[PDB]
Amino acid sequence: EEDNMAIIKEFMRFKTHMEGSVNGHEFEIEGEGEGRPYEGTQTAKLKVTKGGPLPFAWDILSPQFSKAYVKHPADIPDYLKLSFPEGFKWERVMNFEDGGVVTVTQDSSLQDGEFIYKVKLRGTNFPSDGPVMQKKTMGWEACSERMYPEDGALKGEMKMRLKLKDGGHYDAEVKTTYKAKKPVQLPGAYNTNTKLDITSHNEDYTIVEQYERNEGRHSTGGMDELYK
Ligand code: NA
Ligand code: NA
Ligand code: NA
Numbered sequence: 001e002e003d004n005m006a007i008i009k010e011f012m013r014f015k016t017h018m019e020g021s022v023n024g025h026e027f028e029i030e031g032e033g034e035g036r037p038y039e040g041t042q043t044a045k046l047k048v049t050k051g052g053p054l055p056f057a058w059d060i061l062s063p064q065f066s067k068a069y070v071k072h073p074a075d076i077p078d079y080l081k082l083s084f085p086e087g088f089k090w091e092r093v094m095n096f097e098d099g100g101v102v103t104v105t106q107d108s109s110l111q112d113g114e115f116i117y118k119v120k121l122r123g124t125n126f127p128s129d130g131p132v133m134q135k136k137t138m139g140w141e142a143c144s145e146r147m148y149p150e151d152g153a154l155k156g157e158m159k160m161r162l163k164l165k166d167g168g169h170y171d172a173e174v175k176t177t178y179k180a181k182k183p184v185q186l187p188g189a190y191n192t193n194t195k196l197d198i199t200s201h202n203e204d205y206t207i208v209e210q211y212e213r214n215e216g217r218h219s220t221g222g223m224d225e226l227y228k
Helices: 003-006
Strands: 012-022 025-036 043-051 089-094 100-112 114-124 137-140 143-150 153-164 169-180 191-202 205-216
Touching: 012 043, 137 191
Parallel strands: 012 114
Antiparallel strands: 012 025, 025 043, 043 205, 089 100, 089 169, 100 114, 137 153, 143 153, 143 191, 153 169, 191 205
16 A cells, blocks of 8 residues: 555664563563564564573574565555554464464554564474474474454464474474554455574574565465465
8 A cells, every 4th residue: 555665664673572481481582673564574683581401492482573564566455564553463373283372463563764573483392302492403494474364454374394403304383363453454364375484503502693585476376366
């Protein structure tokens, strides 16, 4: 929309704060990021500010650090962009295959021309000798999130696959609800294709940089809607 393209510029910065705990270990992270919301790309630079070094895999946190930066076809309402400047909230559950659980709540707003993200995380039930608490993971596979409208919100479901250092994958089933603070136009069902990379980190993962690409694609409509 015109007013929304006026405030969600083609280059946007963000600030983020997470406070969480994993298996009872409390921590805080601050970060800053930047990206191109209409091109689907962003980077972030995170710093552990309390509770470091973290005694678990950074990879369970990386997907919690920004769907305002999803490239959308013009004919798919970009609900999360349209939610600004008030913004949106999201809530997520991740069920990992060994019984570990992460749940997340998040607030996204726009202040002084930058996005402001506030993340709260609670991770529980990870086995002590499992890949999360033993730091045996090596980043996510690319993922397609199946998006669909329901009861006034946007929901996404995905199977995320964490690569394991000794081979194979450690899987999570994930469901997220995204809901604008004000009613704006919901899309139909479509897919968000994501690739999230850790581009650098220090030895103990107290300093981390990430890159993600996110693009919405039609899942119906055939060749006409392919690459729209
Ligand atoms: Na970028
Ligand atoms: Na852009
Ligand atoms: Na626990």
